[PDB]
């Protein structure tokens with residue numbers, strides 16, 4: 001819309017719906033800083049607000065109440081701070097009810113934002129989380145333009161049973177559609193190899209980085225953070241996927257150099 | 269030695285999905301000063317209630333209690349040098365925050381606890397949870413090393429008419445103690461710094477704008493200066509000028525929410 005007046009509200013290119021930790025580097029707590037480094041602005045709508053990841057001996061907090069979550073999304077439209085919105089990334093969701101609301105918000109939002117790149121990360125592994133899969137299939141999946149599932153995630157989501165490249169690539173294809181343009185499947189195979197397969201309607205690219213064995217969390221969230229930034233900045237999908245992975249590696253090293261059990265972002 | 273993240277400051281206040289108030293503005297400000305901080309939200313609103321709409325609420329007592337205990341169980345307070353408190357949500361939250369602080373004193377005796385008695389304005393009266401004022405005076409004040417209340421917030425804390433500069437100074441003086449080393453009264457723009465042995469009246473430009481969060485910016489900047497080695501009055505004057513600065517940039521930017529310009 002060219003005929004729209006100037007909005008005195010803040011603007012952001014991305015709305016990241018993920019978890020938030022007071023202490024830690026996961027979800028938006030690590031995503032937002034990363035996006036900010038790429039020179040982009042972002043609004044972070046938490047799914048859950050925890051003291052830290054449930055991976056430590058103790059953690060506190062819970063899932064954001066629907067009325068709240070619902071309001072947070074709505075408010076953004078009312079404050080009129082979505083003119084520059086070019087993408088919406090979804091990470092760890094706390095409940096299926098949240099996914100439905102987000103899907104409702106996204107459906108209505110697309111009507112005005114056609115270039116809206118709804119990237120979705122199918123976090124369904126704690127075997128599977130209850131009710132979360134169907135919610136994804138019915139609400140988010142149909143809207144997602146890109147999905148970054150891992151072997152497992154892709155397996156339960158597609159019901160298919162990937163056992164080899166072709167299989168994993170085939171399942172990916174089955175998810176493509178008029179809306180879903182790509183599927184970035186990843187797998188962590190000491191020294192942990194990170195195998196990534198980029199699948200689209202007219203091509204299948206592959207990338208493979210060697211990774212440091214660690215208990216560091218948020219690497220996936222960080223990856224998605226740099227994936228989306230690389231894309232909103234013009235990089236080719238497979239180019240953005242490659243870099244993103246290199247960036248995550250640069251971060252994990254830097255993090256281990258300072259011997260930190262939680263990710264630390266070094267200048268980008 | 270610890271491998272856990274560390275922070276010089278722990279900011280306990282409001283958080284908004286959209287807007288520049290509470291830790292939303294304070295954290296980024298603290299970062300600009302090259303300091304680490306852990307933000308513990310007391311309320312998680314969509315935006316400030318000064319808008320047509322707003323959603324969200326107070327963080328549950330168990331959550332709030334946990335966020336604090338977590339910082340300890342995680343052992344990320346090895347470098348803790350100050351704790352700032354801003355917009356609180358409930359008196360139960362302040363009471364919990366107080367106990368937590370009384371605990372930290374045992375292993376952080378030099379701790380600089382700075383509280384912003386967000387209770388009301390002279391042109392609004394008490395605009396927060398009615399129970400907060402009592403909770404402040406009862407639990408938080410006793411721990412505070414320094415506080416930053418406005419004329420009205422000072423009347424509610426001391427129960428004295430602070431409309432007169434001298435009467436206000438007097439009210440502030442009576443508050444000082446072995447714990448409370450200073451009181452930055454607020455009300456161009458006049459900012460009075462009161463210490464057991466002195467009184468400084470700082471005054472800078474004033475802008476007619478309904479920009480919210482400036483208070484939180486002030487404290488975030490004030491605390492940074494104190495921790496960065498600046499003397500009290502100098503820190504108070506710098507924090508105030510920074511805020512004046514920020515608002516000019518925001519207005520210049522034709523925006524209704526604060527925007528941090530490079531420091």
Ligand SMILES: Nc1ncnc2c1ncn2[C@@H]1O[C@H](COP(=O)(O)OP(=O)(O)OP(=O)(O)O)[C@@H](O)[C@H]1O
Nearest residue numbers: 384416417418454457473474475482483486508511
């Ligand atoms: N419109 C303004 N013009 C100039 N300085 C301002 C303005 N608004 C805020 N400030 C600066 O911010 C400081 C404190 O913030 P603010 O005035 O919002 O809080 P307050 O209601 O006086 O009290 P508190 O410290 O509880 O927020 C002021 O005293 C001043 O130094």
Ligand SMILES: [Mg+2]
Nearest residue numbers: 385386387483
């Ligand atoms: Mg105030």
